[PDB]
Every structure is written in C-alpha cells, then in structure tokens.
Write a protein that binds this ligand. Structure first.
Ligand SMILES: O=C(O)c1ccc2nc(N3C[C@H]4CCC[C@@H](C3)[C@@H]4OCc3c(-c4c(Cl)cccc4Cl)noc3C3CC3)sc2c1
Ligand SMILES: CC1=C(/C=C/C(C)=C\C=C/C(C)=C/C(=O)O)C(C)(C)CCC1
Lengths: 15, 220, 212, 11
C-alpha cells in the first residue's frame, strides 16, 4: 500500500 | 534529583538508545571507497536507510508508543525522522572529518551546506551528554504538532513525562548555565526549519530515486 | 532581571488595538508598522546595531505577528480576530482555499493558548525570545543576541515560578509552542510568496517589503 | 529595505 515497509516494520515488535 | 520512576524511565530509554548501532560494514566505507559526488551520495543513502531502520526500532521501545493509533505511529515517524537524524548527526560531529566532506561533495545545493554545519556548531556548544541527546530525540519523535495525527492528546501524554526528566537532568549535569534546558528547546524550534526545507533539498539533490524506505518516509 | 518582565508586559500593553486572505494581509501590513513600535520597547533591542535590528525583524515578523493575533483570538470560537476588528472563521478560510494552515493555527496556537490560559507577560516573553533569534543569518554579533534571549529565558522562568508555582512544567509548556509557531510561520511565508508570484491578492507596501 | 530602516530610527 502507501506505507508498505513502515507498516511491516511497525508490525514486528520487541527485539 | 530524579524520582524512582524517572530513573527507571531513563535506563529503559538509554538501553534502547545504546542499541542504536550502525554496522561495521557501512562505517567501513568511509575511507575505503573513492571520493566522488556519485559515490558519496550512495554511501549517505545507505547510512540514512539503515538509520531510519534503527530509529524506527528505537521509536517502538518508547513508553506507550504501541498504544497509539497505528496510522498515527506513521505520522510521528515521517514528521520526526529528519529532526532525529540531525540530532544524531550532531552527536557524531561533536565526538568525522571524512563524513563531513562526503556530505559537502555529494551534489547538495550549496545553499543548504553552511546552515547545516552552523546548526552542528550551535548544538556542540551546548555540550550535551548522552542522556540529553537520547531525551531530546525522544521528545522530537513524540511531538503532537505534526501533520496527519488524529489523536494528538494521546501523543502529548507520552511526551510530557520526558520533559520533567530532561529539565532535572539539565540542572544536574549543567548547574553553571541554568538556562541550558531552555536552550535545548531552542534547538527544537530550529530543527523545524530543516524539516520544512528537507523536501526541496532532496528534490534538488544532484544524482544519476533514493531507496524505497526513504522514498516512503519523505514521499515521492 | 536585565530583561525586566514588566518592561515586556508594558510593551504588549503599549500596542493593543469578502476574501479572508485579503483581510489577513491587510491586518498584517497594518500591524507590521506597530510591530516596529513593539520591538523598540523590548529591553536592549534598540541598543543593537541597526543592521541587526533590521535582520531580527525581517527574520521574526511573520512568527511575531501570528503569535500576537493568535493570543488575541483566545476568546473567539473556531476563528481569528484580525487587528482591524474583523473575524475570520474556519469555514471562510476553508472556502477561500487556505483551510489546512488556518486549522493548524487554531489547534496548535489559538486553542493551546486558551487551554493553558497564557497571560500577556508570558506571550510578550515568548514573542521576545522569537525577536532575539541568534540563528538569524547575517548577524554582526550572534553572541550578544543569544545573551539577550538567555536573559528572557531567565526572566520568564522566574515569572512562571512566582506566578504559577503549582505547575512546575509551565516554563517548558510555554517554550514548546515555539517549534509549532516556527513550522506554522514557515508554511505561511510559503503561502505568501506563492500569492505574490501569481498575484491573486493585493499586498500593501510594508508586507511587500518584508516579502522581498 | 527602506520602510523598515525609516521606522527603526528614533535617536
Ligand atoms: O552510530 C554511529 O556510529 C553512527 C555513525 C555515523 C552516522 N551517520 C549517520 N548519518 C549520516 C548522514 C547525515 C546525518 C543523518 C543520516 C545518518 C545521514 O543523512 C544523509 C542524508 C540527509 C541528511 C543530511 Cl545529508 C544531514 C543531516 C540530516 C539528514 Cl536527514 N538527507 O538526505 C540524506 C540521504 C540522501 C538521502 S547516523 C550515524 C550513526
Ligand atoms: C495566518 C494566515 C497567513 C497570514 C499570515 C501572517 C504571517 C500574518 C498575519 C497577520 C495578521 C492578520 C495579524 C493581526 O491581525 O494581528 C496566510 C494568509 C499566509 C494564510 C492563511 C493564514
């Protein structure tokens, strides 16, 4: 979508 | 002096902040590689892409960040990134002579160069300690005033705790200049001009496209 | 202080008063005149070299004016009170093509000033901090300007501890309006150059001068 | 910047 990589990176979590 | 909770909030933050690490492989290409405009650009872009990843990781570990609306988390990251990158790059130049020259000779319009480097002077002369950097970078990230944020008041709740801590910690580390705290907030003001002019620096940058992550976080 | 807080108050008190964008530009030019008068009543500003005085105001005018109308608008709802007497309201602003920015003034400046009930002594001090901008380009002595700003920083922190001791994070709440104000001010200049360039709005002499 | 210079003079 519009923020493809940022979505994916914000949906990963702790270390 | 700090409270019990304020001291734990700092160690949390400081542990996320000391986990900021650039790879050896990326810093390896600071003297090794040749010294051209097109080659200098490529390195910065690689570092800046890695920096956003690291910064994104740091941002997630901040108190209460994942409780924010998902789409707001993206509004804070795009709104704050540049300003956070300027703070971290100032910490580099006040602790380097090759990186400064790479930036100078990488096809940026000259208009932008001197203002950029006098900003780093202005910061260095505050003589900030590790903890003051890490708190200023978090306060910049959790700024409620950014564009496209729906739940503003939620972002203000997370930031405020950190303003108490930095005020007290500025009077601990620098009691000789009792306006040192307010001077940090003076750079929060000044970071906003760099943010505002950053889109046009990117679109005037001289090249032969950045990287998808940078294209996302600053727009195309 | 050597920035006496009463002198800053006196200076704010000394200067009290179809298409919304024409009306706003007309108020701006009107008030640009009285901004010069305001500046000369801030302690030590006239003592600076004339070239620096010019620079500080050429750098500050837009942020100085916006803060002043913003604080004046505290009492109006979803709108702005221009120094000419006229209201401008959200609807009028949106429908004249400048709504996004107008909304930012309201939420980040006007309503934030209301919610914390900032007084004229506080506004004056914020406005003086803006005036004494040591980062302004071309300044003959940035250190003497940073020094004057540090004095206002001291006088304001003093005032906030005396008057509002029950809220120890007030000094910082005050100063965190200034990055918002800088961002809003830059967006307004960006609007104003574009207006000048396409010529859709009459622009009076003093504003025209500031815009060059 | 004529207007501004003229206004800043008062002594
Ligand atoms: O942890 C470390 O050891 C470390 C060492 C070096 C280092 N350099 C860093 N940089 C250098 C560079 C300057 C500061 C911010 C960026 C990250 C990187 O930005 C490059 C940049 C900038 C920029 C510059 Cl050139 C100066 C200041 C801020 C920015 Cl965003 N704008 O665009 C670009 C790329 C073309 C897309 S982070 C870092 C960490
Ligand atoms: C904010 C306003 C902008 C104008 C701004 C500025 C910078 C000035 C000033 C003045 C007034 C109107 C002062 C007063 O009444 O005291 C413009 C039109 C670009 C866009 C719409 C919102």
């Amino acid at each position: 979508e519009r923020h493809k990589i940022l979505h994916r990176l914000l949906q990963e979590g702790s270390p | 002096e700090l409270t019990p909770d304020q001291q734990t909030l700092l160690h949390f933050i400081m542990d996320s902040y000391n986990k900021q690490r650039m790879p050896q492989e990326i810093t390896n290409k600071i003297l090794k590689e040749e010294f051209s405009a097109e080659e200098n650009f490529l390195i910065l872009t690689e570092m800046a892409t890695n920096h956003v990843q690291v910064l994104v990781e740091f941002t997630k570990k901040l108190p209460g960040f994942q409780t924010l609306d998902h789409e707001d988390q993206i509004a804070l990251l795009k709104g704050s990134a540049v300003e956070a990158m300027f703070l971290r790059s100032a910490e580099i130049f006040n602790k380097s002579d090759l990186l400064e020259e790479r930036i100078r000779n990488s096809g940026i319009s000259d208009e932008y160069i001197t203002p950029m480097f006098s900003f780093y002077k202005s910061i260095g002369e505050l003589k900030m300690t590790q903890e003051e950097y890490a708190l200023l970078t978090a306060i910049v990230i959790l700024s409620p005033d950014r564009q496209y944020i729906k739940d503003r008041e939620a972002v203000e709740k997370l930031q405020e705790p950190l303003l108490d801590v930095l005020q007290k910690l500025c009077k601990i580390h620098q009691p000789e200049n009792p306006q040192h705290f307010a001077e940090l907030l003076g750079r929060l003001t000044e970071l906003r001009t760099f943010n505002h002019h950053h889109a046009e620096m990117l679109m005037s940058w001289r090249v032969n496209k950045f990287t998808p992550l940078l294209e996302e976080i600053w727009d195309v | 202080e050597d920035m006496p807080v009463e002198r800053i108050l006196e200076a704010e008190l000394a200067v009290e008063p179809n298409d919304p964008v024409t009306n706003i530009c007309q108020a701006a030019d009107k008030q640009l005149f009285t901004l010069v008068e305001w500046a000369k009543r801030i302690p030590h500003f006239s003592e600076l070299p004339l070239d620096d005085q010019v620079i500080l105001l050429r750098a500050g005018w837009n942020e100085l004016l916006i803060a002043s109308f913003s604080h004046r608008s505290i009492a109006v709802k979803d709108g702005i009170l221009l120094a000419t007497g006229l209201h401008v309201h959200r609807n009028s602003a949106h429908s004249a093509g400048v709504g996004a920015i107008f909304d930012r003034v309201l939420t980040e400046l006007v309503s934030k000033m209301r919610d914390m009930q900032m007084d004229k002594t506080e506004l004056g001090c914020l406005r003086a901090i803006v005036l004494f901008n040591p980062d302004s380009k071309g300044l003959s002595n940035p250190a003497e300007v940073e020094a004057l700003r540090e004095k206002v920083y001291a006088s304001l922190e003093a005032y906030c501890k005396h008057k509002y001791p029950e809220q120890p994070g007030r000094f910082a709440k005050l100063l965190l309006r200034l990055p918002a104000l800088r961002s809003i001010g830059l967006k307004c200049l960006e609007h104003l150059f574009f207006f000048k360039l396409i010529g859709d709005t009459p622009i009076d002499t003093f504003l025209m001068e500031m815009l060059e």
